[model samples]
Target: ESADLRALAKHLYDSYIKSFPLTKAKARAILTGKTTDKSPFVIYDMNSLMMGEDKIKEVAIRIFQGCQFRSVEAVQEITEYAKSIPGFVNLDLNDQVTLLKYGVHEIIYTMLASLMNKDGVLISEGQGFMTREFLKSLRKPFGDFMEPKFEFAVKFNALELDDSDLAIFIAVIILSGDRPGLLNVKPIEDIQDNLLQALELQLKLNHPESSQLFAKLLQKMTDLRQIVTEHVQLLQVIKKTETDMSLHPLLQEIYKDL
Candidate 1:
């Protein structure tokens, strides 16, 4: 079944090539803080720095709304990719939903590396860079949300994984057996084992020089889980305090159980 699994990995790689929003070269540039000569747009106005708390909160809301808007599309693409994986759609319908619900945030955080660097994250389809200082200016919990993610992304980008590697890795994440409320743990685990095998093969093939790259990627997954846990806690705080801000419905569903 090694050949069969390798073919499955190739299928997933092709699916990723079709579904991913940006090219590996472009994503790498973004992660390393490269940008065109044109002045990068800020997600919120720099003038907001001169404004009062009310205006800052308004800017925060705007930023969150924009992020959620993009996340909706990401979720759609992720769902499509998940369905493309063999055996994914065969699981119980509710279990399918549950896996996505629990897994989406982690996947998003992982993908976010494509848009982030030590200094900031690219936003608005690469039209802008939301600098760390600007986010920190928002202060307290509002500013706190992205710092951990930024830290994680910096380390993650160091791994230098291509889209094909990420494809199988993402499959491994989606097919995780430990997600709560799962009705079919064994089947999920079976698929995940195959995915892990494929991921190892792909990583070895891609990064022949790095002997520990696969182990490092697994560590990154654990690190991603920690980031998601913190992110969800922050969301809960924001939900309680920012009563006027509305989360996108899909995001609402994802966070409902967490």
Candidate 2:
């Protein structure tokens, strides 16, 4: 890329993040980039396996509410990134929404990884972090809420992706058109491919020692896909088993066709 192009890229990236920062800032701030000052909160009392029916429903609804809050933030982040990426906003509005509906879970899980350690993530949006061992201790269906996502996140963080890498990769995720309906699938896929190429090029220059991180990142996309596939199934089980759970309308819409 030329000097002028590089300047434009940086400007666009900086401007967008400034306007609409990642909503997980507090979670990420203490989770990954800094030292751990506080220990994770033990959620044993909220353990559904031992709880009464009302308590189980209450806890599940609270946990799912926090999850949905973060999911909405993830979608906002993707929408903001779509605006920043040069070609994404030019697509049909319905196509853009459709792409996001299918892609939000994967994107949210990717962002969720930012808050994960080898142990577990912050449960109630960083206020209540839990360890994986503790999570495993929770009973059968409810105990395993975020365990699989943590497994994927631990591996993803090991990749050591920086903000520049995440920005382009997220843009690629938002532009993907593999969902059920798209008004202009070809153009959306083309943009996604172009972003992938740009990401590869950026990685080559930025990571001289290991440009193959681009391939590793692409593989993480596949990992995210599988993780979210199972997550939706788990969500279906939640609907079947629990009554008080409140999945956000948008999140429910995204999961409806799945």
RMSD of each: 4.0, 4.6
TM-score, predicted candidate 1 vs. hidden true structure: 0.88
Across residues 1-258, which tens digit of lDDT does each residue of candidate 1 receive? Answer: 668867988899899878877656565565444565444455444563334223222676666776788889889889989999889999999889988998887888998887877788776556566777777767567877878888998899899887888889999999987998999899989889988999988888789998889999998988988998888888888889878776778898788876
In candidate 2, list every pair of residues with a backbone clash.
none
Top candidate when judged by TM-score against the true structure: 1
Ten consecutive residues with minimal summed lDDT in candidate 1?
48-57
Q: TM-score of each candidate?
A: 0.88, 0.81
State in Å the error of residue 219, model 2: 1.4
Whole-model alpha-carbon lDDT for candidate 2: 0.70
lDDT by residue for model 2 (202-243), tens: 777778888489888888888988898888888888788877
Off by over 4 Å in 2: 1-12, 19-29, 32-58, 123-128
